[PDB]
mmCIF file of N, CA, C and O and ligand atoms in Angstrom:
data_model
loop_
_atom_site.group_PDB
_atom_site.id
_atom_site.type_symbol
_atom_site.label_atom_id
_atom_site.label_comp_id
_atom_site.label_asym_id
_atom_site.label_seq_id
_atom_site.Cartn_x
_atom_site.Cartn_y
_atom_site.Cartn_z
ATOM 1 N N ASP A 198 100.903 87.832 81.639
ATOM 2 C CA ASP A 198 101.943 86.878 81.303
ATOM 3 C C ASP A 198 101.347 85.456 81.444
ATOM 4 O O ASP A 198 101.686 84.693 82.342
ATOM 5 N N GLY A 199 100.382 85.155 80.567
ATOM 6 C CA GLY A 199 99.714 83.863 80.489
ATOM 7 C C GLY A 199 99.399 83.217 81.776
ATOM 8 O O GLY A 199 99.471 81.982 81.865
ATOM 9 N N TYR A 200 99.013 83.962 82.810
ATOM 10 C CA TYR A 200 98.748 83.412 84.136
ATOM 11 C C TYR A 200 97.505 84.032 84.694
ATOM 12 O O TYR A 200 97.247 85.232 84.498
ATOM 13 N N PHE A 201 96.733 83.261 85.456
ATOM 14 C CA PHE A 201 95.628 83.733 86.237
ATOM 15 C C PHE A 201 96.001 83.585 87.699
ATOM 16 O O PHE A 201 96.258 82.481 88.172
ATOM 17 N N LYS A 202 96.065 84.704 88.438
ATOM 18 C CA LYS A 202 96.513 84.716 89.823
ATOM 19 C C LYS A 202 95.406 85.205 90.734
ATOM 20 O O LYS A 202 94.774 86.219 90.433
ATOM 21 N N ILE A 203 95.162 84.489 91.797
ATOM 22 C CA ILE A 203 94.147 84.822 92.797
ATOM 23 C C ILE A 203 94.805 84.921 94.169
ATOM 24 O O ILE A 203 95.513 83.994 94.600
ATOM 25 N N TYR A 204 94.580 86.025 94.867
ATOM 26 C CA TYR A 204 95.116 86.259 96.194
ATOM 27 C C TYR A 204 93.953 86.490 97.143
ATOM 28 O O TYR A 204 92.981 87.162 96.807
ATOM 29 N N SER A 205 94.056 85.923 98.344
ATOM 30 C CA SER A 205 93.001 86.060 99.330
ATOM 31 C C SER A 205 93.576 86.124 100.736
ATOM 32 O O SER A 205 94.659 85.553 100.977
ATOM 33 N N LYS A 206 92.874 86.824 101.636
ATOM 34 C CA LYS A 206 93.271 86.873 103.062
ATOM 35 C C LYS A 206 92.000 87.141 103.837
ATOM 36 O O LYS A 206 91.428 88.249 103.794
ATOM 37 N N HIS A 207 91.531 86.141 104.575
ATOM 38 C CA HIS A 207 90.289 86.232 105.312
ATOM 39 C C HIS A 207 90.517 86.979 106.611
ATOM 40 O O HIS A 207 91.389 86.618 107.407
ATOM 41 N N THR A 208 89.705 87.975 106.871
ATOM 42 C CA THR A 208 89.915 88.823 108.058
ATOM 43 C C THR A 208 88.622 88.949 108.851
ATOM 44 O O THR A 208 87.538 89.051 108.294
ATOM 45 N N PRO A 209 88.720 88.882 110.191
ATOM 46 C CA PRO A 209 87.556 89.076 111.063
ATOM 47 C C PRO A 209 87.167 90.554 111.191
ATOM 48 O O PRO A 209 87.600 91.208 112.170
ATOM 49 N N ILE A 210 86.401 91.085 110.253
ATOM 50 C CA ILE A 210 86.002 92.480 110.294
ATOM 51 C C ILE A 210 85.188 92.756 111.536
ATOM 52 O O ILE A 210 84.227 92.050 111.878
ATOM 53 N N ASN A 211 85.588 93.830 112.291
ATOM 54 C CA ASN A 211 84.893 94.215 113.512
ATOM 55 C C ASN A 211 83.673 95.069 113.191
ATOM 56 O O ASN A 211 83.195 95.058 112.042
ATOM 57 N N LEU A 212 83.180 95.770 114.197
ATOM 58 C CA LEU A 212 81.926 96.524 114.089
ATOM 59 C C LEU A 212 82.180 97.828 113.283
ATOM 60 O O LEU A 212 82.241 98.911 113.788
ATOM 61 N N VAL A 213 82.308 97.634 111.980
ATOM 62 C CA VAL A 213 82.394 98.717 111.009
ATOM 63 C C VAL A 213 81.396 98.454 109.890
ATOM 64 O O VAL A 213 81.338 97.354 109.347
ATOM 65 N N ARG A 214 80.626 99.483 109.519
ATOM 66 C CA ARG A 214 79.628 99.307 108.479
ATOM 67 C C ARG A 214 80.245 99.114 107.106
ATOM 68 O O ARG A 214 79.641 98.525 106.210
ATOM 69 N N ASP A 215 81.495 99.583 106.913
ATOM 70 C CA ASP A 215 82.170 99.505 105.634
ATOM 71 C C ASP A 215 83.530 98.845 105.771
ATOM 72 O O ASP A 215 83.841 98.259 106.828
ATOM 73 N N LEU A 216 84.344 98.956 104.749
ATOM 74 C CA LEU A 216 85.693 98.358 104.775
ATOM 75 C C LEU A 216 86.491 99.052 105.884
ATOM 76 O O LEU A 216 86.559 100.287 105.931
ATOM 77 N N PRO A 217 87.092 98.283 106.791
ATOM 78 C CA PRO A 217 87.788 98.882 107.929
ATOM 79 C C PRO A 217 89.175 99.416 107.555
ATOM 80 O O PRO A 217 89.712 99.143 106.514
ATOM 81 N N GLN A 218 89.744 100.217 108.479
ATOM 82 C CA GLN A 218 91.075 100.718 108.328
ATOM 83 C C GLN A 218 92.073 99.637 108.718
ATOM 84 O O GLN A 218 91.724 98.462 108.907
ATOM 85 N N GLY A 219 93.361 100.026 108.836
ATOM 86 C CA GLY A 219 94.406 99.066 109.165
ATOM 87 C C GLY A 219 95.099 98.569 107.921
ATOM 88 O O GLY A 219 95.395 99.317 107.031
ATOM 89 N N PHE A 220 95.422 97.277 107.919
ATOM 90 C CA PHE A 220 96.084 96.657 106.778
ATOM 91 C C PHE A 220 95.775 95.192 106.728
ATOM 92 O O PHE A 220 95.387 94.550 107.701
ATOM 93 N N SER A 221 95.990 94.629 105.512
ATOM 94 C CA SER A 221 95.823 93.174 105.328
ATOM 95 C C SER A 221 96.639 92.808 104.097
ATOM 96 O O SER A 221 96.595 93.471 103.085
ATOM 97 N N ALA A 222 97.354 91.670 104.203
ATOM 98 C CA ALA A 222 98.257 91.206 103.146
ATOM 99 C C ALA A 222 97.577 90.035 102.434
ATOM 100 O O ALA A 222 97.390 88.988 103.054
ATOM 101 N N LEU A 223 97.226 90.194 101.164
ATOM 102 C CA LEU A 223 96.557 89.152 100.418
ATOM 103 C C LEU A 223 97.577 88.139 99.975
ATOM 104 O O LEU A 223 98.374 88.383 99.037
ATOM 105 N N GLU A 224 97.588 87.004 100.641
ATOM 106 C CA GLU A 224 98.534 85.958 100.357
ATOM 107 C C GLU A 224 98.194 85.273 99.001
ATOM 108 O O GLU A 224 97.009 85.142 98.672
ATOM 109 N N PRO A 225 99.214 84.851 98.254
ATOM 110 C CA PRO A 225 98.949 84.052 97.053
ATOM 111 C C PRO A 225 98.239 82.739 97.416
ATOM 112 O O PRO A 225 98.591 82.097 98.434
ATOM 113 N N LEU A 226 97.279 82.351 96.592
ATOM 114 C CA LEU A 226 96.463 81.180 96.901
ATOM 115 C C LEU A 226 96.465 80.137 95.816
ATOM 116 O O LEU A 226 96.445 78.917 96.124
ATOM 117 N N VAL A 227 96.508 80.510 94.529
ATOM 118 C CA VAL A 227 96.571 79.571 93.432
ATOM 119 C C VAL A 227 97.037 80.312 92.207
ATOM 120 O O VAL A 227 96.883 81.537 92.077
ATOM 121 N N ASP A 228 97.660 79.589 91.274
ATOM 122 C CA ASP A 228 98.136 80.088 90.016
ATOM 123 C C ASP A 228 97.843 79.103 88.940
ATOM 124 O O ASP A 228 98.068 77.893 89.133
ATOM 125 N N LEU A 229 97.221 79.548 87.811
ATOM 126 C CA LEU A 229 96.724 78.566 86.833
ATOM 127 C C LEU A 229 97.315 78.846 85.433
ATOM 128 O O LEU A 229 97.579 80.003 85.090
ATOM 129 N N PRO A 230 97.540 77.791 84.588
ATOM 130 C CA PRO A 230 97.957 77.943 83.207
ATOM 131 C C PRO A 230 96.838 78.476 82.310
ATOM 132 O O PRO A 230 96.152 77.672 81.641
ATOM 133 N N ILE A 231 96.631 79.775 82.280
ATOM 134 C CA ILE A 231 95.562 80.456 81.577
ATOM 135 C C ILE A 231 96.212 81.392 80.548
ATOM 136 O O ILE A 231 97.407 81.339 80.328
ATOM 137 N N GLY A 232 95.407 82.241 79.912
ATOM 138 C CA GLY A 232 95.895 83.038 78.785
ATOM 139 C C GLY A 232 94.797 83.300 77.767
ATOM 140 O O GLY A 232 95.016 83.940 76.760
ATOM 141 N N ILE A 233 93.598 82.768 78.054
ATOM 142 C CA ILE A 233 92.408 83.121 77.276
ATOM 143 C C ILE A 233 92.207 84.629 77.377
ATOM 144 O O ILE A 233 92.575 85.289 78.372
ATOM 145 N N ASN A 234 91.568 85.200 76.347
ATOM 146 C CA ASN A 234 91.300 86.667 76.324
ATOM 147 C C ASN A 234 90.320 86.975 77.458
ATOM 148 O O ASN A 234 89.318 86.310 77.642
ATOM 149 N N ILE A 235 90.639 88.083 78.166
ATOM 150 C CA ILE A 235 89.821 88.540 79.265
ATOM 151 C C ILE A 235 89.478 90.016 79.048
ATOM 152 O O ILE A 235 90.328 90.830 78.695
ATOM 153 N N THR A 236 88.177 90.325 79.092
ATOM 154 C CA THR A 236 87.728 91.695 78.978
ATOM 155 C C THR A 236 86.695 92.068 80.027
ATOM 156 O O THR A 236 86.633 93.205 80.467
ATOM 157 N N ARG A 237 85.859 91.117 80.438
ATOM 158 C CA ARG A 237 84.773 91.361 81.379
ATOM 159 C C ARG A 237 84.675 90.217 82.358
ATOM 160 O O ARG A 237 85.320 89.182 82.216
ATOM 161 N N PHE A 238 83.837 90.438 83.385
ATOM 162 C CA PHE A 238 83.633 89.424 84.409
ATOM 163 C C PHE A 238 82.293 89.700 85.100
ATOM 164 O O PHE A 238 81.701 90.752 84.930
ATOM 165 N N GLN A 239 81.844 88.683 85.827
ATOM 166 C CA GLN A 239 80.561 88.745 86.523
ATOM 167 C C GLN A 239 80.603 87.892 87.781
ATOM 168 O O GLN A 239 81.243 86.826 87.787
ATOM 169 N N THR A 240 79.964 88.370 88.845
ATOM 170 C CA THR A 240 79.868 87.627 90.079
ATOM 171 C C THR A 240 78.625 86.762 90.133
ATOM 172 O O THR A 240 77.695 87.002 89.352
ATOM 173 N N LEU A 241 78.583 85.826 91.031
ATOM 174 C CA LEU A 241 77.457 84.929 91.203
ATOM 175 C C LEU A 241 77.033 84.865 92.662
ATOM 176 O O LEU A 241 77.867 84.627 93.551
ATOM 177 N N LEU A 242 75.747 85.100 92.917
ATOM 178 C CA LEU A 242 75.185 85.015 94.274
ATOM 179 C C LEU A 242 73.949 84.126 94.229
ATOM 180 O O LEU A 242 73.271 83.953 93.189
ATOM 181 N N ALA A 243 73.634 83.536 95.396
ATOM 182 C CA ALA A 243 72.524 82.561 95.486
ATOM 183 C C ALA A 243 71.205 83.325 95.629
ATOM 184 O O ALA A 243 70.963 83.998 96.647
ATOM 185 N N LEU A 244 70.323 83.197 94.626
ATOM 186 C CA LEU A 244 69.027 83.782 94.710
ATOM 187 C C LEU A 244 68.127 82.968 95.637
ATOM 188 O O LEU A 244 68.223 81.725 95.654
ATOM 189 N N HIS A 245 67.331 83.636 96.446
ATOM 190 C CA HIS A 245 66.430 82.982 97.396
ATOM 191 C C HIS A 245 65.244 82.400 96.669
ATOM 192 O O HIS A 245 64.264 83.087 96.420
ATOM 193 N N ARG A 246 65.321 81.112 96.335
ATOM 194 C CA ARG A 246 64.208 80.423 95.661
ATOM 195 C C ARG A 246 64.050 79.019 96.302
ATOM 196 O O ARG A 246 63.723 78.043 95.583
ATOM 197 N N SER A 247 64.229 78.918 97.614
ATOM 198 C CA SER A 247 64.099 77.652 98.300
ATOM 199 C C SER A 247 62.646 77.172 98.339
ATOM 200 O O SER A 247 61.767 77.905 98.840
ATOM 201 N N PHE B 543 120.368 74.106 93.847
ATOM 202 C CA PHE B 543 118.954 74.023 94.147
ATOM 203 C C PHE B 543 118.044 74.519 92.992
ATOM 204 O O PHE B 543 117.964 75.735 92.764
ATOM 205 N N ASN B 544 117.415 73.586 92.308
ATOM 206 C CA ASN B 544 116.435 73.902 91.250
ATOM 207 C C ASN B 544 116.998 74.833 90.222
ATOM 208 O O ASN B 544 116.344 75.796 89.830
ATOM 209 N N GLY B 545 118.221 74.569 89.787
ATOM 210 C CA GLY B 545 118.894 75.411 88.798
ATOM 211 C C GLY B 545 119.697 76.520 89.358
ATOM 212 O O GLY B 545 120.713 76.924 88.780
ATOM 213 N N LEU B 546 119.259 77.094 90.501
ATOM 214 C CA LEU B 546 120.007 78.162 91.171
ATOM 215 C C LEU B 546 121.331 77.593 91.686
ATOM 216 O O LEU B 546 121.320 76.657 92.494
ATOM 217 N N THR B 547 122.437 78.123 91.206
ATOM 218 C CA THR B 547 123.748 77.595 91.519
ATOM 219 C C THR B 547 124.560 78.595 92.374
ATOM 220 O O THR B 547 124.463 79.819 92.165
ATOM 221 N N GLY B 548 125.317 78.057 93.313
ATOM 222 C CA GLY B 548 126.128 78.920 94.136
ATOM 223 C C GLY B 548 126.848 78.073 95.182
ATOM 224 O O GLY B 548 126.697 76.834 95.247
ATOM 225 N N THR B 549 127.655 78.768 96.029
ATOM 226 C CA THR B 549 128.414 78.107 97.069
ATOM 227 C C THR B 549 128.004 78.686 98.443
ATOM 228 O O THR B 549 127.818 79.945 98.545
ATOM 229 N N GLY B 550 127.840 77.850 99.412
ATOM 230 C CA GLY B 550 127.496 78.310 100.744
ATOM 231 C C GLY B 550 127.379 77.153 101.705
ATOM 232 O O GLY B 550 127.596 76.004 101.333
ATOM 233 N N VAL B 551 127.024 77.487 102.938
ATOM 234 C CA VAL B 551 126.825 76.529 104.001
ATOM 235 C C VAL B 551 125.360 76.406 104.296
ATOM 236 O O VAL B 551 124.707 77.385 104.679
ATOM 237 N N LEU B 552 124.813 75.210 104.107
ATOM 238 C CA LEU B 552 123.373 74.959 104.294
ATOM 239 C C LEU B 552 123.144 74.557 105.723
ATOM 240 O O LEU B 552 123.275 73.410 106.139
ATOM 241 N N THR B 553 122.732 75.541 106.540
ATOM 242 C CA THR B 553 122.472 75.310 107.961
ATOM 243 C C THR B 553 120.976 75.531 108.230
ATOM 244 O O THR B 553 120.372 76.487 107.740
ATOM 245 N N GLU B 554 120.373 74.615 109.000
ATOM 246 C CA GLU B 554 118.945 74.719 109.307
ATOM 247 C C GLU B 554 118.646 75.979 110.085
ATOM 248 O O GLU B 554 119.377 76.326 111.054
ATOM 249 N N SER B 555 117.621 76.705 109.655
ATOM 250 C CA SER B 555 117.258 77.993 110.272
ATOM 251 C C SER B 555 115.773 77.983 110.613
ATOM 252 O O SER B 555 114.984 77.184 110.084
ATOM 253 N N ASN B 556 115.389 78.902 111.514
ATOM 254 C CA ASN B 556 114.038 79.027 111.998
ATOM 255 C C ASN B 556 113.227 80.083 111.255
ATOM 256 O O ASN B 556 112.197 80.530 111.786
ATOM 257 N N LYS B 557 113.646 80.476 110.056
ATOM 258 C CA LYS B 557 112.917 81.494 109.286
ATOM 259 C C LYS B 557 111.478 81.061 109.088
ATOM 260 O O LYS B 557 111.196 79.896 108.708
ATOM 261 N N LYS B 558 110.531 81.967 109.306
ATOM 262 C CA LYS B 558 109.119 81.705 109.166
ATOM 263 C C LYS B 558 108.713 81.859 107.721
ATOM 264 O O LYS B 558 108.162 82.885 107.272
ATOM 265 N N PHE B 559 108.974 80.809 106.949
ATOM 266 C CA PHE B 559 108.619 80.785 105.537
ATOM 267 C C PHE B 559 107.130 80.529 105.354
ATOM 268 O O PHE B 559 106.626 79.488 105.810
ATOM 269 N N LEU B 560 106.451 81.468 104.710
ATOM 270 C CA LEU B 560 105.057 81.224 104.368
ATOM 271 C C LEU B 560 104.981 80.165 103.228
ATOM 272 O O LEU B 560 105.935 80.002 102.471
ATOM 273 N N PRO B 561 103.850 79.474 103.110
ATOM 274 C CA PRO B 561 103.807 78.365 102.159
ATOM 275 C C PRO B 561 104.145 78.741 100.725
ATOM 276 O O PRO B 561 104.742 77.951 100.012
ATOM 277 N N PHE B 562 103.730 79.928 100.282
ATOM 278 C CA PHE B 562 103.994 80.338 98.909
ATOM 279 C C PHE B 562 105.449 80.712 98.700
ATOM 280 O O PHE B 562 106.008 80.520 97.620
ATOM 281 N N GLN B 563 106.098 81.315 99.725
ATOM 282 C CA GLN B 563 107.428 81.833 99.586
ATOM 283 C C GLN B 563 108.448 80.716 99.331
ATOM 284 O O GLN B 563 108.323 79.593 99.870
ATOM 285 N N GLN B 564 109.472 81.012 98.533
ATOM 286 C CA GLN B 564 110.499 80.034 98.171
ATOM 287 C C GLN B 564 111.875 80.548 98.454
ATOM 288 O O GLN B 564 112.767 79.760 98.836
ATOM 289 N N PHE B 565 112.117 81.846 98.265
ATOM 290 C CA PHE B 565 113.436 82.409 98.432
ATOM 291 C C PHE B 565 113.539 83.278 99.679
ATOM 292 O O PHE B 565 112.539 83.556 100.347
ATOM 293 N N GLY B 566 114.773 83.702 99.962
ATOM 294 C CA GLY B 566 115.056 84.409 101.203
ATOM 295 C C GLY B 566 115.856 85.679 101.027
ATOM 296 O O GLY B 566 116.784 85.928 101.824
ATOM 297 N N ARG B 567 115.533 86.490 100.023
ATOM 298 C CA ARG B 567 116.330 87.690 99.719
ATOM 299 C C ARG B 567 116.405 88.602 100.951
ATOM 300 O O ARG B 567 115.450 88.762 101.704
ATOM 301 N N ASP B 568 117.585 89.213 101.126
ATOM 302 C CA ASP B 568 117.926 90.006 102.291
ATOM 303 C C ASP B 568 117.815 91.493 101.981
ATOM 304 O O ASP B 568 117.288 91.926 100.947
ATOM 305 N N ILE B 569 118.309 92.350 102.906
ATOM 306 C CA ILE B 569 118.252 93.793 102.756
ATOM 307 C C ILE B 569 118.995 94.230 101.492
ATOM 308 O O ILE B 569 118.511 95.034 100.693
ATOM 309 N N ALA B 570 120.202 93.655 101.285
ATOM 310 C CA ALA B 570 120.997 93.968 100.094
ATOM 311 C C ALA B 570 120.612 93.137 98.898
ATOM 312 O O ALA B 570 121.381 93.051 97.946
ATOM 313 N N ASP B 571 119.435 92.492 98.906
ATOM 314 C CA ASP B 571 118.950 91.617 97.854
ATOM 315 C C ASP B 571 119.923 90.488 97.570
ATOM 316 O O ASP B 571 120.454 90.318 96.474
ATOM 317 N N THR B 572 120.173 89.721 98.627
ATOM 318 C CA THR B 572 121.077 88.578 98.556
ATOM 319 C C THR B 572 120.336 87.329 99.012
ATOM 320 O O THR B 572 119.604 87.324 99.975
ATOM 321 N N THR B 573 120.549 86.216 98.251
ATOM 322 C CA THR B 573 119.927 84.946 98.604
ATOM 323 C C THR B 573 120.477 84.453 99.946
ATOM 324 O O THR B 573 121.675 84.320 100.138
ATOM 325 N N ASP B 574 119.556 84.109 100.850
ATOM 326 C CA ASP B 574 119.939 83.614 102.191
ATOM 327 C C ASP B 574 119.076 82.433 102.661
ATOM 328 O O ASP B 574 119.380 81.898 103.700
ATOM 329 N N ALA B 575 118.052 82.063 101.920
ATOM 330 C CA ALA B 575 117.257 80.883 102.308
ATOM 331 C C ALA B 575 116.640 80.242 101.063
ATOM 332 O O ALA B 575 116.132 80.955 100.175
ATOM 333 N N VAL B 576 116.664 78.928 101.042
ATOM 334 C CA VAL B 576 116.048 78.135 99.964
ATOM 335 C C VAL B 576 115.260 76.982 100.553
ATOM 336 O O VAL B 576 115.489 76.565 101.704
ATOM 337 N N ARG B 577 114.319 76.452 99.770
ATOM 338 C CA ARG B 577 113.484 75.313 100.173
ATOM 339 C C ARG B 577 113.886 74.125 99.372
ATOM 340 O O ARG B 577 113.930 74.158 98.136
ATOM 341 N N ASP B 578 114.186 73.039 100.043
ATOM 342 C CA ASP B 578 114.633 71.810 99.396
ATOM 343 C C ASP B 578 113.507 71.214 98.576
ATOM 344 O O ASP B 578 112.403 71.034 99.096
ATOM 345 N N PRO B 579 113.721 70.929 97.286
ATOM 346 C CA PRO B 579 112.633 70.369 96.454
ATOM 347 C C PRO B 579 112.138 69.018 96.933
ATOM 348 O O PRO B 579 110.924 68.755 96.802
ATOM 349 N N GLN B 580 112.996 68.191 97.525
ATOM 350 C CA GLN B 580 112.561 66.872 97.955
ATOM 351 C C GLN B 580 111.692 66.947 99.198
ATOM 352 O O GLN B 580 110.530 66.518 99.180
ATOM 353 N N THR B 581 112.217 67.486 100.298
ATOM 354 C CA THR B 581 111.500 67.660 101.543
ATOM 355 C C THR B 581 111.439 69.164 101.844
ATOM 356 O O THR B 581 112.439 69.850 101.730
ATOM 357 N N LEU B 582 110.271 69.625 102.262
ATOM 358 C CA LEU B 582 110.040 71.056 102.493
ATOM 359 C C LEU B 582 110.778 71.465 103.761
ATOM 360 O O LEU B 582 110.245 71.302 104.870
ATOM 361 N N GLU B 583 111.981 71.947 103.640
ATOM 362 C CA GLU B 583 112.764 72.457 104.733
ATOM 363 C C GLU B 583 113.382 73.790 104.384
ATOM 364 O O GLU B 583 113.735 74.047 103.207
ATOM 365 N N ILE B 584 113.489 74.676 105.368
ATOM 366 C CA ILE B 584 114.040 76.039 105.182
ATOM 367 C C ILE B 584 115.508 75.949 105.567
ATOM 368 O O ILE B 584 115.837 75.715 106.737
ATOM 369 N N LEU B 585 116.383 76.172 104.610
ATOM 370 C CA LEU B 585 117.820 76.092 104.827
ATOM 371 C C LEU B 585 118.439 77.455 104.649
ATOM 372 O O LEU B 585 118.222 78.143 103.633
ATOM 373 N N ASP B 586 119.223 77.878 105.656
ATOM 374 C CA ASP B 586 119.886 79.153 105.615
ATOM 375 C C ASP B 586 121.158 79.043 104.781
ATOM 376 O O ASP B 586 121.988 78.128 104.972
ATOM 377 N N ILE B 587 121.325 79.944 103.802
ATOM 378 C CA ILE B 587 122.475 79.964 102.948
ATOM 379 C C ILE B 587 123.442 81.028 103.454
ATOM 380 O O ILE B 587 123.082 82.202 103.588
ATOM 381 N N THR B 588 124.682 80.592 103.757
ATOM 382 C CA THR B 588 125.686 81.519 104.302
ATOM 383 C C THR B 588 127.017 81.271 103.660
ATOM 384 O O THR B 588 127.538 80.132 103.665
ATOM 385 N N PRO B 589 127.635 82.291 103.072
ATOM 386 C CA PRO B 589 128.954 82.086 102.450
ATOM 387 C C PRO B 589 130.035 81.716 103.485
ATOM 388 O O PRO B 589 129.960 82.149 104.652
ATOM 389 N N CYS B 590 131.010 80.958 103.022
ATOM 390 C CA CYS B 590 132.103 80.573 103.902
ATOM 391 C C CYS B 590 132.906 81.788 104.337
ATOM 392 O O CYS B 590 133.155 82.674 103.497
ATOM 393 N N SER B 591 133.297 81.846 105.602
ATOM 394 C CA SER B 591 134.007 82.989 106.131
ATOM 395 C C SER B 591 135.353 83.121 105.384
ATOM 396 O O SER B 591 136.096 82.166 105.208
HETATM 397 C C1 LIG C 1 89.883 90.394 73.429
HETATM 398 O O1 LIG C 1 88.643 90.639 72.800
HETATM 399 C C2 LIG C 1 88.390 92.002 72.498
HETATM 400 C C3 LIG C 1 86.956 92.143 72.064
HETATM 401 O O2 LIG C 1 86.791 91.518 70.795
HETATM 402 C C4 LIG C 1 89.403 92.471 71.488
HETATM 403 O O3 LIG C 1 89.240 93.867 71.186
HETATM 404 C C5 LIG C 1 90.810 92.326 72.076
HETATM 405 O O4 LIG C 1 91.822 92.644 71.157
HETATM 406 C C6 LIG C 1 91.029 90.874 72.551
HETATM 407 N N1 LIG C 1 92.304 90.813 73.265
HETATM 408 C C7 LIG C 1 93.235 89.890 73.040
HETATM 409 C C8 LIG C 1 94.483 90.013 73.938
HETATM 410 O O5 LIG C 1 93.145 89.013 72.210
#
């Protein structure tokens, strides 16, 4: 519905090698007037080239 | 309030409104809290006895 919605909730993960159990509520963080066609996406990480 | 029309008593309440939340729907899905557009305050909506 012509909207881009992003939800986030920062949690202090304890000594677990993977995603921990329990629960977490992703609070709404921002909403934007979007509506461009979306089919794919890609993440960005910092390559070590210092 | 912001187009939402009704009758009630606007009494200040201690409801823990999260920043994104705006409304105060109850167990029976009834409006019970609104946020003033001018100043951010949580007002309890209660029908007259
Ligand atoms: C988005 O682009 C894809 C790939 O061309 C196309 O098949 C699809 O119909 C488009 N979606 C919208 C909502 O325009």
